[model samples]
Target chain A: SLHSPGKAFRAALTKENPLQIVGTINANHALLAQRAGYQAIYLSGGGVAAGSLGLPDLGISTLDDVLTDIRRITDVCSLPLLVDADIGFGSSAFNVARTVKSMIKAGAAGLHIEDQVGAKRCGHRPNKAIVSKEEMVDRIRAAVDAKTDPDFVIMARTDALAVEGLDAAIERAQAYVEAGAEMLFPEAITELAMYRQFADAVQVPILANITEFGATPLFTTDELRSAHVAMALYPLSAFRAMNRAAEHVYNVLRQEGTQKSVIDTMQTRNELYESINYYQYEEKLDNLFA
Target chain B: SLHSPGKAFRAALTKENPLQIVGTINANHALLAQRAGYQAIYLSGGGVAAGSLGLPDLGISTLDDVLTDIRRITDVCSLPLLVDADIGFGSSAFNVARTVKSMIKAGAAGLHIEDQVGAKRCGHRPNKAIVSKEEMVDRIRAAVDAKTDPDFVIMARTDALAVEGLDAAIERAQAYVEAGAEMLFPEAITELAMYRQFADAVQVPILANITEFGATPLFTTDELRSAHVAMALYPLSAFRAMNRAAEHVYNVLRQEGTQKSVIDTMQTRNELYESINYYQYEEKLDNLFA
Candidate 1:
């Protein structure tokens, strides 16, 4: 009755209400995210930009870059990820379709196809553009039609609010729905009011980007539930905080020539042992020999 | 003159011109970027997210996810990849140092460490939170001190505009330089004016992120030159365009139930062969036989 994307999406959407979706920058991210009590998790373009290239999301990141992330995360997570396929990576409909199917094979449960123009910049950085609703709908249709898995959610994200206006954003969301899109992501919608409008206009479930200091207010799960938002994403939260913390440790060691002071800030050897499941893995090997 | 990060940075800075640092999302991407006209190349975290997880750029991606991409890209590329080691993968300074040295051993020439709020979000998406400038300096210092390769580049990326503002970002860049960063990446600077400021302020090489649509304007090489930006990146340009092109091929096949009309868009089998250097391989075999 169900396959990977279907089962994963359904579980996150229903059984795991307020699904604690962790963020994974790569395949290992998937495993750790899964172990961290996250039913579902996110893979961020920024993660790729920052983690892999040490660069920003200035359109310089590419499709192969993303596909690599997909292969790694999906290979490891074995969960249904909602990929961010920015503008189908191009206007070519065939490419869009292939991306959809490729994601399915890559073990993504769903993916959000944004109407924002390619190549994508950093989400928080905010220099955006959009195409006409009809064109965007075509993009949606192309994506939906590309899916071999009927259950794979084809979520369409609209950046019309920042480009055109909220009304246009809603209008675009409706068209996306008409074009077979299963969900909506209204990008850069700063206000709660906008969420309500999108939710009301598009009867299907909606996603809220409750990123810190971005467009929307840091809405809680209760708030999202009230807003009828289907999902809340904390994409780079862990990576950001983790990076900051790690930097502090780095500073101490660099200045002092020893990590004595900063050692306290790091996840200790014992904690790392736990995080890596060292004992459990070793125990399994021991048991196997026994 | 060289053994590790110290030597690598000096060589790259003094010898290369607009060092053609290519972007790699995976091992294959690394190979491809290396094969392309590139003096140096990079492994992007965003690529891992979008390509591997089929997901977007957010802070949700984890350290493990990035490492996998590092392993894959480095294994195949066999070039000195400057990986994005964001925030040392966690709050531990030791982890940060370990990450740097391990990546170096894994065949990376250099890596960039940022004063970013670690594990925060995708640069493309939004809602960024950053750590203090001093804290970031610590990160750079730690990364610098951790290098086993005196030649490996330890670039520093600063995300101050959206968090601490421009002046702070510039100052942060200086501190990072003092601490031992080989290059400076001023994150999210949309205007070309900022590029000039960075170029003027930092004694090190400056990077301009020329992504499609984001905070930064799409500047050409001429513009970058005038602004004194040392490097202009089109990191994911080819990958994005190629994906879009490939996705279109997939869509046409899905809709038409065959690749009839879409055949034109494909890289002809002949072209793909050329891209893969099959001819060179064939030539080698022939020579052996002769």
Candidate 2:
């Protein structure tokens, strides 16, 4: 409560018109994202499911997985990370409260809890219906009550745009804002105006899930700012690229005995060391021997 | 302890002439190593440090980092994984005891505790002086006494081979075995006969370090088993290869702004699904609707 990165991220939310957040699978990739000078980053549940845990996003990854990723990135990278807490990781309100408290302690700037059913898994799956609107409002209340650090963000993410139509989704968003949601994530909205509707209705910051290979198109800043969307979250896109890159190396190592042909493609040992400030490690050690 | 995977690893140690334990960074790579029909696997501390946490092998990477990697691999892969516990991750006996108990709970089959000084980080760095033999032998006792799961193997790893020479190092191993280390790891030795000396001195299984790009030559099975060593550990090699592969992809993503040209080099989308048994996830879902 005394100090949290939420202050940094909510501050970052204004530094750019729509603060751009990219998702990555590991702290190493998170470093690369920060290296490119991104103001903020995301740790998607699906990204961790497929990329790190080597499983589908099927309720298999626990708070343990989220905590692990959060600790690694927050320890090294200077950026505040927004985490994906799928359905609060438990069925009850006390459990959801713990999810918020645990993540805040583990060093995430904020986390998004969705309105999906208790056992329902993976984000953006509409075949599995979302919970009732009133039930989600109750969930939001529990999340807000859990805050020891009032600045730690609790973003209400709704997949209702696909199932319940925009009117019902906006109604739910207004209700969540009433229940103390600082931000809103409107998933699967195809039109820019849907983002506009959420932004105008909530009177709080609205985030658009502009995911790769999803129904939503990757939006331009002009349309995004025009719509008044505060954040364009590209969840799992950075991970997909890195995952494919890893696949390339695995393939070459199998086909050829060495990676000689693809060596130029690699971030050199020196580059890796530089990313981690390896030279500083030597300087400290040299200071020791002297 | 009733169904600990330590039984699997101890059993695996006998299945091959010398179990070839290869290190991996994540569960995805753990799956690939298992896919090749290897009986055993390793989770190296340095591997988790650089590959997962994106830091150098400093004390910066904690038990949380190691626990995260352990849960992922054990949940998916059928193979038993031996973890690298860098100097037991603590300065005190009770802290080391907790490290043993925590790893057992997190699903690691076993772990090796080295004799390096606390806070002096990075594995295989000889400049940092190791602790006294008597102190390490107490560490062995603390590790053993903490175990409710006696079947969980505690492999005592000593850097004394580098600091105190082969003669003193073998004596340290004998004391550690008496202090209840179920197995022994003598790190950084040259010559085939050094492994033989430890094997002859102690009845417990001996592990040989045959790491790549190190001064010690990668030994053949003839030299290894003939020297009476039970395990030939190649830690960080698999991760080194995969980490480079990731570096390759990052380079191309920045250069061409896409991975389209290197698409064929990847383990296609379907291959990734197959690795995690994606079809099986569907079969259960179909059962749900039915």
TM-score of chain A of each: 0.89, 0.93
The candidate scoring highest on lDDT is 2
C-alpha TM-scores of all predictions? 0.53, 0.77
Report the poorest 10 consecutive residues by lDDT, candidate 2 chain B: B253-262
List model 2 lDDT by residue over B1-290, tens digit each.
26778889989998976777767668876777676556788898877887688878766678877987898888888788899998887788878988999999989989998877855544323355788888988888888888767678889998886667888988989999998899999888789888889999999998887665555766765568889989877675555544455444445433443444444445555666777777788787666764
Encode model 1's per-residue lDDT on B1-290: one tens digit a residue.
Answer: 43343355356544544444555554434434444444456666665555454444444466666666666555444556677777777777888888887887766777777776643422232337788767877888888888886667788887887677888878888888998888887888877787889888888888876654355665655666778787655444433433333333323322332333543433333433343344554365456654
Model 2: per-residue lDDT, tens digit, A217-249?
757555788899898776765455444554454
By DockQ, the best candidate is 2
- Segments in model 1 whose C-alpha atoms lie over 4 Å from true places: A1-3, A18-20, A119-126, A283-290, B1-290
lDDT of 1 by residue, A1-290 (tens): 55566567866788743444445655534554555455676767655654454444545456676776677666645667877777776669988988788778767788888876653432323347777788888988888889887788788888788768778778888889988888888887787767888889988888887544456666666666776777777665444433333333323322332333433333333433343344554455456653
Model 1 Cα RMSD, 1 decimal: 19.8
What's model 2's lDDT at B42? 89
